[PDB]
């Protein structure tokens, strides 16, 4: 009794966040190839985010022979195909089948450094327009070659939120950041996984989610000398970069003996958030 199998890539998703990837003012999105590789070597999305399938999704994936693999910057799904070929799924797929994955957070400081107003809202991504009880606008999960970051366009509240959580059949303990839903056939050919005859596409679909970082005014407090000073413009919070402040002109009301002082960059553990400016307090 001989038994054989063959597996091929089905879908790729790119998971990024500026807090870990940018270097001070330098934007990851504008880096060259060597610079990009260098930053990626220190990044692992699992440091802050947890991703897993719903119970129904797991059941379906077993039935259709779909597997879930992960890498420090991405997720790849793979599917069993017929022996002798590259593009015919072993089991027939239908247009309205879908997979649902849930997002949750492990990093307690996510909300301090991530520039997104998540208060009382659900974050939702998909490749097909939903049917919800109240009027809303919709944009799909962005493709790998598109610009932009996660914003308010992906947030839901009230009845629309309630509806989506119920359809996904979520656990009473909640703790969900958001929901990702991918359909075999989406709202346009470039967002679909399969062709009209069920054949896998000949160009792997490649989607992206990218979070932006928060900026703030830095305030320096010197208790022994009894003086306070602030910077003139906001600077970004990053994990690994460094901004050098060394001119009197950089500050509002700089100290008499500025030349003898050193001004450290702030952490993202404590921050004041207001409707206008954000502030970071640093003690000398």
């Amino acid at each position: 009794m001989q038994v054989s199998s063959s597996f091929r890539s089905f879908l790729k998703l790119d998971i990024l966040h500026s807090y870990f990837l940018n270097d001070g003012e330098k934007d990851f999105s504008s880096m060259n190839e060597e610079e990009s590789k260098t930053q990626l070597k220190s990044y692992n999305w699992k440091d802050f985010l947890e991703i897993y399938p719903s119970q129904k999704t797991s059941h379906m994936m077993r039935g259709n022979k779909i597997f879930f693999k992960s890498f420090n910057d991405s997720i790849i799904l793979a599917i069993k195909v017929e022996s002798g070929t590259e593009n015919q799924p072993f089991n027939e797929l239908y247009e309205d089948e879908s997979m649902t994955f849930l997002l949750s957070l492990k990093d307690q400081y996510f909300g301090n450094y991530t520039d997104l107003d998540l208060a009382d809202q659900l974050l939702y991504f998909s490749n097909k327009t939903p049917v919800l009880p109240e009027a809303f606008t919709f944009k799909p999960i962005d493709r790998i070659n598109q610009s932009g970051t996660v914003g308010e366009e992906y947030l839901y509240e009230g009845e629309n939120k309630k509806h989506l959580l119920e359809e996904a059949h979520l656990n009473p303990g909640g703790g969900v950041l958001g929901i990702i839903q991918i359909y075999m056939k989406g709202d346009t050919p470039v967002l679909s996984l399969i062709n009209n005859d069920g054949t896998l596409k000949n160009s792997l679909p490649h989607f992206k989610i990218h979070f932006s970082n928060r900026k703030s005014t830095w305030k320096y407090i010197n208790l022994k000398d009894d003086f306070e000073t602030e910077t003139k413009k906001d600077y970004p919070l990053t994990k690994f970069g460094f901004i050098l402040l060394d001119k009197k002109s950089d500050f509002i009301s700089p100290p008499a003996h500025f030349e003898k002082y050193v001004f450290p960059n702030p952490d993202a553990r404590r921050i004041k958030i207001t409707p206008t400016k954000n502030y970071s307090e640093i003690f000398i």
Partner: protein, 655 residues
């Protein structure tokens, strides 16, 4: 429901429920149901072609419904005279036209024989009969759709089709089974249970065919497919009854002294008068305020209910006149038309019946309105419907102290219409020839007329039992063996539950050609043994001459082992192909096989004699496999074989 806390007492008749079982081999059942819904309280058939897991018969019935009522039950009463004495014959034959929907009955047998949790695929719902002698059909395309659907499920191991034998041709029957065997070979982990088309010589429209020889010609696949299934013969007689309703069974009554019309006509003459409907029609045509109002509403409601009951009595007698007027169909039409028109005042055309219903619901609400507000006691009349419903009886009675302005009214069109019915019925008095008093009546309506005849008929109806193909019982029997002894034990010498007897008798000199045959297409037998009852005798596959795969237990053991091993190797789909992987893969597989050996599945003094596993460069792989990305795993197993023949030799002792 129930409102008062406490203990309630009810009296019912049914079979006791079975004891729930533990998961074992899981069958799938593909066929027709009555509801197919996800939420019992709504009417949407959302489960069509959506496989669902069921733990017990009780769960089946809350999503899928029960059996279809049989429409083929005939009851005939003949009244004659013997030397001037009355003589009545009651005849209730076995139905010749049966409903082709066996899913419910098959599941009862499955659970009775020890089955556990299973999958149900509903391919559609039951159709109505076209006539008393024209039953619903089975659509081949629906069964193929269900088979395609089950291909995507992981858990099922056995495939069954409860109504394959009710399919219009033998050619369609055989085609469906060939597809199931092909599915099993494509997947390499399922087994098919097969039935013959019929246990009796059946006519294909050209020739008379023997059922065992016909199956052998029908299933025309090679050994690669035949090794994945087995067949059983004959069908069995069970202890289950037919489902029916007394309200659907019409009595034929013939008599030496006809009186069907005369009786109906006399009853109608009583109907068309003041003691039946004129009195009704003449009468029909803030907490204290609510109490007074509620009393007045109840009075009207009671009066309407009497008028409604009157309609029902009329239909019951007129219909016997119609049924009995066999000759002169012109009169049957005249009677029918008169009745059809009468009914329009009560039916949806102008529905007196819904007015009465609505007033009852409104009456409860107004009495309860006092619970919390003066507002409710207003809304119930002017926001809600009390005003609107009374209007449907008299459009504007309120116009004057004496009811007036009846622009429309639901009352008293009855007078003329009753006259039309009677006149039409009376036309049949010189037409009837041989129909007696009970002709055309329902069983449920004759008990008050004659409960001796009624009780006798019911006893005769319930003497008829259900007959089924043996396949759902066998899935049950497989489950018992797998749990008590293990999958490596042959599924034979097992008694069956709820079986009276096999449909036909097979002797030991007949079974020889079922067990051993030149084609290898063995058939297992169901046989009766003295002091034991009905047993499964034989356990071979459809590739019976195969030295390796002829036994069912060997094939099933291997399918089980493959499922577990496959899961063990799938964990490495995108892992590095190197020594660290090869070692982990081997260790996982060997631990599984050691446990199977410890439990007695495999032969051998020590694991070293029971099995082997080989994985790795230089053993199963070369440089070319490393380059391509292949991983090759080789496994061998020592599997135990059964005894079939015991020979006893006798002689005299010498001394």
């Amino acid at each position: 429901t129930y409102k008062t806390p406490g203990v309630y007492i009810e009296e019912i008749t049914k079979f006791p429920p079975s004891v729930a079982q533990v998961e074992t081999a899981i069958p799938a059942f593909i066929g027709y149901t009555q509801f197919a819904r996800t939420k019992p309280s709504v009417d949407s058939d959302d489960l069509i072609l959506k496989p669902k897991r069921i733990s017990s018969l009780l769960d089946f019935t809350t999503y899928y419904g029960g059996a279809q009522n049989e429409q083929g039950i005939t009851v005939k009463l003949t009244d004659t005279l013997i030397e001037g004495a009355e003589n009545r014959t009651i005849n209730v034959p076995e139905p010749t036209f049966k409903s082709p929907y066996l899913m419910f009955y098959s599941l009862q047998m499955y659970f009775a024989n020890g089955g556990g949790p299973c999958y149900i695929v509903s391919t559609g719902v039951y159709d109505d009969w076209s006539d008393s002698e024209t039953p619903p059909t089975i659509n081949f395309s629906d069964l193929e759709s269900g088979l395609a659907v089950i291909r995507k499920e992981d858990e099922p191991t056995l495939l069954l089709f409860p109504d394959a034998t009710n399919l219009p041709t033998d050619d369609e029957f055989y085609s469906l089974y060939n597809s199931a065997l092909m599915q099993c070979n494509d997947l390499q982990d399922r087994f098919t249970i097969l039935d013959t088309y019929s246990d009796q010589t059946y006519n294909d429209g050209v020739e008379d065919l023997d059922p065992i020889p016909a199956l052998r010609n029908g299933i025309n696949l090679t050994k690669d497919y035949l090794k994945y299934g087995a067949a059983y013969y004959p069908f069995v007689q069970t202890i289950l009854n037919y489902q029916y309703s007394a309200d659907e069974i019409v009595i034929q009554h013939l008599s030496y002294n006809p009186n069907a019309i005369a009786t109906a006509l006399d009853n109608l003459n009583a109907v068309n008068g003041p003691t039946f409907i004129d009195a009704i029609l003449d009468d029909l045509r803030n907490s204290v305020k609510v109490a007074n109002f509620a009393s007045l509403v109840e009075s009207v409601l009671s009066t309407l209910n009497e008028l409604i009951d009157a309609k029902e009595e009329i239909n019951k007698d007129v219909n016997s006149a119609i049924a009995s007027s066999e000759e002169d169909n012109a009169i049957k039409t005249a009677i029918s038309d008169a009745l059809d028109v009468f009914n329009e005042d009560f039916e949806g055309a102008d529905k007196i019946e819904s007015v009465a219903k609505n007033l009852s619901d409104l009456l409860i609400k107004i009495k309860q309105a006092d619970t919390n507000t003066k507002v409710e006691n207003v809304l119930s009349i002017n926001a809600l419907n009390f005003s609107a419903e009374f209007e449907k009886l008299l459009t504007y009675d309120v116009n004057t102290g004496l009811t007036a302005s009846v622009t429309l009214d639901l009352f008293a069109n009855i007078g003329t219409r009753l006259d039309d019915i009677i006149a039409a019925v009376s036309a049949a008095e010189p037409i009837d020839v041989n129909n007696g008093k009970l002709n055309g009546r329902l069983l449920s309506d004759i008990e008050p007329l004659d409960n001796a005849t009624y009780n006798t008929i019911l006893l005769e109806i319930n003497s008829h039992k259900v007959t089924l193909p043996p396949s759902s019982s066998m899935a049950g029997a497989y489950a018992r063996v797998d749990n008590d002894r293990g999958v490596w034990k042959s599924p034979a010498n097992i008694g069956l539950n709820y079986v009276s007897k096999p449909s036909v008798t097979v002797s030991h000199e007949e079974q020889e050609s079922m067990n051993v045959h030149g084609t290898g297409k063995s058939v297992n037998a169901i046989r009766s043994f003295v002091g034991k009852g009905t047993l499964v005798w034989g356990a071979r596959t459809l590739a019976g001459n195969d030295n390796e795969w002829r036994y069912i237990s060997v094939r099933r053991f291997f399918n089980m082992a493959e499922e577990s091993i496959k899961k063990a190797t799938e964990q490495f789909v995108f892992e590095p192909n190197d020594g660290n992987t090869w070692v982990r893969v081997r260790a996982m597989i060997e631990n599984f096989l050691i446990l199977q050996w410890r439990a007695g599945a495999l032969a051998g003094a020590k694991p070293e004699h029971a099995f082997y596993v080989k994985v790795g460069l230089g053993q199963t792989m070369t440089a070319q496999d490393i380059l391509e990305g292949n991983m090759n795993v080789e496994i061998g197993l020592a599997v135990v074989r059964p005894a079939e023949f015991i020979i006893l030799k006798f002689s005299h002792k010498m001394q």
